[PDB]
Design a binder for this molecule. Structure first.
Ligand code: HEM
Ligand code: HEM
Ligand code: HEM
Ligand code: HEM
Ligand SMILES: [Fe+3]
Ligand SMILES: [Fe+3]
Ligand SMILES: [Fe+3]
Ligand SMILES: [Fe+3]
Ligand SMILES: [Fe+3]
Ligand SMILES: [Fe+3]
Ligand SMILES: [Fe+3]
Ligand SMILES: [Fe+3]
Ligand SMILES: [K+]
Ligand SMILES: [K+]
Lengths: 154, 154, 154, 154, 154, 154, 155
C-alpha cells in the first residue's frame, strides 16, 4: 500500500471522527431542547460518519497501514440551531476538500479501489451539504420560529 | 417497620396526591381549550402519579403503618398554559426535595427496599422535570402561539 | 352555566373524590390482608368513581365554572371487613341523596343534559348499594369466616 | 298524539333543516378555500343534523302529525372563518332554547319518549356548542393565521 | 475481591441453602397431606431460593473467592401448617437481617454491584415475608380448618 | 413401611444431596473458567440429582418416614478439570454401591416399588459413570488442552 | 441545575467511554483483518456497549445543564497481538471501574441518586466485561494460545 494513500486515508478518518462527535453532540442538544426532528436527523448523520470511519479503517488495515483513532481534531459546537447547522456545514466543506485531494492521489498511483471508496463517501458528504443548505435556506424562507416549530415532533 | 420512614412515605404519598388532582385538572383544562396534545400528556402524568400513590400505599401497609389519603395539600392551579406548566414544575421541585430527604433516612435505618421504591419514583419525577423545562424552553424558542398551535391535535 | 347547578356538580364531584380514596385504601387493605377478591372488586369501584369525577369535571368546565378538586371531606375508613362495607354503604347512601337533590335542581332550570349525566351516575351508585347490601346479607347467611374464605382468591 | 308536541317537533325540525343547509354550504366554502379540515368537520356537523331531521320526521309520522319540510328559515352565512363559526354558534344557541321548551312541554303532557328523543338531540347540539366555543377561543390563543393553517390539511 | 464481602456472600449463600431444603421439605409435606396449593406455592419459594444461591455463587467465583456449599445450617422443620409457616417466617426474618449487614459492608468498601445483587435478593425475601405474615393473618380471620380447606385444590 | 428401608432411602437421599451441591459447584466453576460446555453439562447433572431427591422425599414421606435434608456429607471438589471429573466419578462409584445394598434390602422385605425407584435411579447413575469414564478416556486420546478447547463453547 | 462536581465526574466517565469506544473498535477491526472473526465480533459488541453508555452520560449531563466534553481523547492502549489486546482492554476497565466508584460516592454525598443509579448500571456492565477478559486470558493458559485463537477464527 502506497504510503501517502494511507496518510490521506488517515486524514479522512480524522475528519470522520470529528463529525461523529460533533454530530452526535449536536443531536443530543437538539433533543434536550425538544427539537426531536433535528435530533433524529442529526443522529442519523452521525451514524453515517461512523460507517465511513469503519470502512476507512478496514481499508487501511488491508493496505497494511496503522489506523489512527488517537488524534481528535477540533469540534465545531454551535450554541443555537442556526450556528449548529453552519458549523456542520463548515466541517463538511472541509472534508469535501480533503476527499478531493485524496481521490487525486489515489488516481495518480493507480489505487482505484481506495478511489472508489472515497468517491462513495464524497457522494454522501455532498448529500449532507445539500440537506444543510436546504435547512439554512428554509429558515430564511419560513423564518426561524416556524422552522423550529416544524422540528419539534417526528 | 420503622416509624419515621413511614412518616416519610406518608409525606411522599401526600405529594403524589396533590400532583394527581393538579395534573388531572390541568389536563381537563387543556382539553376544554382545544389543546388536546397537552391535555393528553398531562393526563398521562396524572396517571403515572396515581401509580406511585398505589405503590406508596402498598409499601406503607406492608410496613404495618396507616396510609393517609385524608390530608390533601395545596393545588397550584395555573390559569394559562405558561402558569400551569410553571406550577407543575414548582410542585415537582418540592416533591423531588422530600424524595431525597426520605431516601437519606431509609439508607440511615437500612430500609433498602423503600429506598429503591423512592428512587424509582424519583427518576420518574426527574423525567417529568425534563419534560416541563423543555416545554418552557420551546415556548421561548418558537413563541407562545406556535407552541400552542403545535398542541391543538394529538 | 346556572350558578347553582355548578354548585350541585362541584358538590357531587366532592363526594366522588371522597369515594375514590376511601375505596382505594379499602382495596389495598383487603389486598394486604390476603382477601384479594374483595380488594379487586373494591379497586374497580374506586375506578368507577374516578370516571365519574372526570365526567363531572368536564361538564363543569364546559359550563364555564371552576371544578373544585381542592376540598376533601371525611373518609370513612373501617377496621374490619364488615365495617369497611358498612362505611362504603353510608357514603353511597349519602351520595345518592345529593344526587337526587341535584337532579331536582337541573330539572327546574332546564339543564336536561346535566340531569342526564347525574341520572347515569345515580344508577351506577344504586348498583354499588345493591352489591354492598348483598354482601352484608351474605355474611349473615354463610357466616363471617365462610364469607371471607370465599374472598381470598380471584 | 298531542297537537302541541307535534308543533314543537315541527319547530325543532325547522331548526335542523336550516342547520343542514347552513353547515353544508360552510363546509363547501371552507373546502373551496383549501381549509379542508374545517370543511370535513363541518360536513359531519351537517350530516348529524340530517340524522336528527330523520329521527324527528319518523316521530311526527308515528304520532300522526304532518312533517313540515317546506318552511326553511334564515341561513346564517358567514364570509370568513370567524363569521362562519359565530353564525353556527348563534344558530345553535337559538336551537338549544327551542329544544328546552319542547322538552318542558313533552314532560307536561307525559310524552316521555319524545322528551327522550329531544334530550339526545339536545346533548348533541351542546357538543356542537363546545366545539364552536373552543375554536373561537383557539383563534384568540394561537392567532387567526396559525389557526387557519392548522386547518388546511386533514 | 474484598475479603469481608465474600464472607458476607458466603453467609447469605448459607441462608439460601437452609431455605432451599426447608422450603422444599415443607412443600412435599404439604403435598403428602393433600394441601396441594400450599405444596405448589412452597415449591416455587424453594425454587426462588435456588436462583438466589446460583447468583451468589456466580458472584463469589467472579470475585475469586471460594463458594461454601459444604456447611449446611440448621433447618426449621415444622410439624403442622401453622408451625411450618412460622418457621419459614423466622428463617426469613433472620436472613433479612444478614442481608442488611452485607449491604452496609458492600456500600462501605464501594462494592456497589454486590450491593445491588443483595438489594434484589432482599426485596424478594421481603415479598416472601408478606406472603407469610398474610397467611398467618388469614388463619385468624377464616379459621384454621377453612384455611387448609382453601388450599387443597390448585 | 419397613424401618430399615427408610434408612436406606435417607442414605441414598444423603448421597443425592451431596452430588447436587458438588455438581452445582463444579458447574459454576467451569462457567467461571469459560468452559461452558462442561459447565452446562455439569449443571444438567445437578438437576438430575435434584429430581432423584425429590422422588426419594416423596416416597419416604408416603412410607411415613422422616426425610433427612439436614446432614450434608463430604463434598469432593476438584481444583482442575481432571480432578473434578475424577471426584464426580468417585462419588458416583460410592452411590452405585449404596443403591445396590438398598435394592437387596427392598427385595428381601418385599418393598418392590421402592426397589423399582432405586433401580431407575441406578440406571441413571450408571449413565453418568459412562459419561465420566468416557470424558477421562477422551483426555488421554486427544490431550487435555484439546479436550478443554472442545468444551469452551456451547 | 445539577451539582458541578457530579458533572465533572460525569464528563470524566464519559471521557473513559470515548477511549474504550475507539480502543475496542480498532481491536475489533484488527482481529478481523487477522481472520480472528469471533474475537472481532465480540469486541465490536463491546465497542457498541460503550457508545451506549456514552449516550446516556451525554443525556444526563445536558439534563443537569452541564457541557458534555467529547473533545479530549485520553490515551488508547493498542496491543499488537491478541494477548496484549485483551490485557490492554483489561487495564482500561480497571481504570474505568475505579473512576466510576469515586463518582458514585460523590453522588451519594450530594444526594443525586438518579445519577448514582445510572453509574451503577454502567459499572455493572464494565464488571461483566472484566469477567470476560479475565476468562479469555485464563483460557489462553488452559488450552494454549494457538488452540485459543483457533477457536476464534469462525463465528
Ligand atoms: C387516591 C387517589 C387516586 C388513586 C390512588 C388512583 C389510582 C388509579 C390507578 C392505580 C389507576 C390505573 C392506571 C392504569 O390504567 O394502569 C387509575 C386510573 C384512572 N384514574 Fe385514578 N387514582 C386516584 C385519583 C383519581 C382522581 C382524582 C381522578 C380524577 C378524575 C382519577 C381518574 C382516573 C381515570 C379516568 C383512570 C382511567 C381508568 C380507566 O379508564 O380504565 N383518579 N387511577
Ligand atoms: C342541502 C341539502 C342536503 C345536502 C346537500 C345533503 C348532502 C348529503 C350527502 C353528500 C350525503 C352522503 C351520502 C353518501 O354519499 O352516501 C348525505 C346523507 C344523508 N342525508 Fe343529506 N343532504 C341534504 C339534505 C338532507 C335532508 C333534508 C335530509 C332529511 C333527513 C337528509 C338526510 C340524510 C341522511 C339520513 C343521510 C345518511 C346519513 C347516514 O350516513 O346515516 N339530507 N346528505
Ligand atoms: C434439597 C435439595 C434440592 C432439591 C430437592 C432440588 C430440586 C429441584 C427440582 C425438582 C427442580 C425442577 C427441575 C425441573 O423440573 O426441570 C429444581 C430446579 C433448579 N435448582 Fe434445585 N434442588 C435442590 C438443591 C439445589 C441447589 C443447592 C441449587 C444451587 C445450589 C439448586 C439450583 C437449581 C436451579 C438453578 C434450578 C432451575 C430453576 C429454574 O427452572 O429456573 N437446587 N430443583
Ligand atoms: C461519539 C462517540 C460515539 C457515540 C456516542 C456513538 C454512539 C452510537 C450509538 C448510540 C449507536 C447505536 C447503537 C445501537 O443501538 O445499535 C452507534 C452505532 C454504531 N457506531 Fe457509534 N458512537 C460513537 C463513536 C463511534 C466510532 C468511533 C465508531 C467507529 C470507529 C462507531 C461505529 C459505529 C457503528 C459501525 C455502529 C452500527 C451502525 C449501524 O449498523 O446502524 N461509533 N453508535
Ligand atoms: Fe424538516
Ligand atoms: Fe410537544
Ligand atoms: Fe382542529
Ligand atoms: Fe363474592
Ligand atoms: Fe390462599
Ligand atoms: Fe396543501
Ligand atoms: Fe380432592
Ligand atoms: Fe469464545
Ligand atoms: K406556525
Ligand atoms: K367453608
Amino acid at each position: 500500500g502506497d504510503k501517502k494513500v494511507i496518510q490521506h486515508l488517515n486524514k479522512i478518518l480524522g475528519n470522520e471522527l470529528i463529525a461523529i462527535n460533533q454530530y452526535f453532540l449536536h443531536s443530543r442538544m437538539w433533543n434536550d431542547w425538544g427539537l426531536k426532528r433535528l435530533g433524529a436527523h442529526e443522529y442519523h448523520e452521525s451514524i453515517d460518519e461512523m460507517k465511513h470511519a469503519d470502512k476507512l479503517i478496514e481499508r487501511i488495515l488491508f493496505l497494511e497501514g496503522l489506523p489512527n483513532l488517537q488524534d481528535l481534531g477540533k469540534l465545531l459546537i454551535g450554541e443555537n440551531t442556526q450556528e449548529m447547522l453552519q458549523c456542520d456545514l463548515n466541517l463538511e466543506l472541509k472534508a469535501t476538500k480533503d476527499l478531493r485531494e485524496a481521490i487525486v492521489h489515489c488516481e495518480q498511483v493507480h489505487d482505484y479501489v481506495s478511489r472508489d471508496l472515497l468517491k462513495d463517501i464524497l457522494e454522501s458528504e455532498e448529500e449532507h451539504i445539500d440537506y444543510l443548505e436546504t435547512q439554512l435556506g428554509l429558515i430564511q424562507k419560513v423564518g426561524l420560529e416556524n422552522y423550529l416549530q416544524s422540528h419539534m415532533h417526528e
